[PDB]
Amino acid sequence: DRPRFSFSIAAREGKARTGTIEMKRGVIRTPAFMPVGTAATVKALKPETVRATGADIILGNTYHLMLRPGAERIAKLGGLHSFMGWDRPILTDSGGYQVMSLSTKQSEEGVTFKSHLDGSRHMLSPERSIEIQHLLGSDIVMAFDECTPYPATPSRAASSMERSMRWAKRSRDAFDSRKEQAENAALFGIQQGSVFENLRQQSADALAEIGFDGYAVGGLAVGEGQDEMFRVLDFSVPMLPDDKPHYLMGVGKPDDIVGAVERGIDMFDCVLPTRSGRNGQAFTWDGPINIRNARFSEDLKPLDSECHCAVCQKWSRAYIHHLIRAGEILGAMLMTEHNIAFYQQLMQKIRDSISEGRFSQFAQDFRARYFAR
């Protein structure tokens, strides 16, 4: 009864947009932050807790899931949604980045690699990546890509991007060939081209000619720094179709997100709130804090005194400081819940401010406070 994929822009301010993506398993409010659920879990959180923070969609990692527990096994057990107990949309990455980063023989067919878990040999290609994502049952499927190497010659960046675009076409065809997947899921293409404007334009042109439900900006946050990332976004996002969502992969810190929204990004995923939470870093409106620091040992205030999350209604900095220092699982649980909730509250403030035509003021006020610490 619900649409497969319908993106509606409710309001704009400059290059920033806010709206909704309607899918069969639910609505995604944009700009959206996707918690990362690597191995079929958002680390340290039950799915009901993830939803309670405000998340509309989560990300799964194809590379990890294809190795453990395996895509065929997850399919036999009813698909990823049933397996993990999350009934809302899931976006899966293609695996093309982790094979190169977490594993390796690359050719036009795909990449063959050795598993980090045990050294067993495996293969990923556009067709196999799409089939794995089909078996997982994910709602948003990412085309199999290659991250343009950084730094690299313009010619190496170009040949990499061109291969990635041929892989995008192969991914489109594989997805379209599977009727159940084509009728129930969406397919996003990934723009490559490193920091080179002409290559980003050629990539965008190729992707629009193939046609996708959404367009990701790939190849960023790979060591170039925020200033350069924003410079590339300045020219790259306008090259993508305006009427489809724009997804910045693997970004980022709160200030990265705000600046990327100012440049036309609608969707984000990042390991920071979960991973840094487990390591003792909490995000607050006055900047990040390291909760293990001695200054918090007797601080009875919550992590953030304006945060609406359940953790900040019930527990102090002093208690969470103790838990993390003692290596207690509850410390990781509470830090992660707060950090994901903080990210969702940030996204809500972004959406409301764009809707209300006051996003420029919000971004200025946010930065002045977040960086004042």
Window of 67-75, 224-232, 249-257, 339-347 that interacts with its own copies by CB under 8 A: 67-75
d(CA 174, CA 228): 35
Amino acid 234 reads: D
Q: Is 199 in the site for ligand AMH (CB under 6 A)?
A: no
Residue 208 burial (CB count, 10 A): 16
Q: Of 46 and 367, which has the nearer Cβ to its own copies?
A: 46
Residues contributing to the annotated binding site for substrate = 93-97, 145, 192, 219
**Of the residues 56, 93, 139, 256, which is catalytic?**
93
The pair of three-digit structure tokens given for residue 197, joined into one six-digit string: 């404007």
**Of the residues 213, 256, 269, 304, which is catalytic?**
269
Binding residue (CB under 8 A) for its own copies from 3, 85, 211, 357: 85
CB 33 within 8 A of CB 21: no
Q: How far is CA 107 from CA 111, 122, 126, 229, 367, in A?
A: 6, 14, 12, 29, 44
Window of 11-19, 34-42, 203-211, 261-269 that interacts with its own copies by CB under 8 A: 34-42
The pair of three-digit structure tokens given for residue 45, joined into one six-digit string: 């959180």
Out of ligand AMH, Zn ion, its own copies, none, which partner does residue 309 contact, by CB within 5 to 8 A per kind? Answer: Zn ion
Q: Is 7 in the site for ligand AMH (CB under 6 A)?
A: no
Q: Is 220 in the site for its own copies (CB under 8 A)?
A: no
Query: Comparing C-alpha atoms, which of 52, 49, 140, 162 is closest to residue 92?
Result: 140
List the interface residues with its own copies, window 328-357 (CB under 8 A).
Answer: 328-330, 332-333
Residues contributing to the annotated binding site = 93-97, 145, 192, 219, 307, 309, 312, 338
Annotation marks residue 266 as catalytic: no
Binding residue (CB under 8 A) for its own copies from 173, 209, 228, 298: 298
Cβ 372 to Zn ion, closest distance in Å?
20
Annotation marks residue 93 as catalytic: yes
Q: Of 150 and 285, which has the nearer Cβ to ligand AMH?
A: 150
d(CA 134, CA 99): 19
d(CA 321, CA 298): 9
Question: Residue 339 burial (CB < 10 Å; 0-12/13-18/19+)?
Answer: buried
d(CA 76, CA 9): 38
Q: Is 294 in the site for its own copies (CB under 8 A)?
A: no
End-to-end CA distance of the chain: 48
Q: Which residue minimizes CB distance to ligand AMH?
A: 250
Site map 97..116 versus ligand AMH, x via CB under 6 A: x-------------------
Residue identified by tokens 């699982």 is 329
Cβ 256 to ligand AMH, closest distance in Å?
11
d(CA 107, CA 322): 51
Amino acid 66 reads: M
d(CA 220, CA 237): 12
Interface contacts to its own copies, rule CB under 8 A: 39-41, 43-46, 68-69, 73, 76-78, 83-85, 278, 297-298, 300, 314-316, 318-319, 322-323, 325-326, 328-330, 332-333
- Give the catalytic positions in this structure: 93, 269
Interface contacts to Zn ion, rule CB under 5 A: 307, 309, 311-312, 338
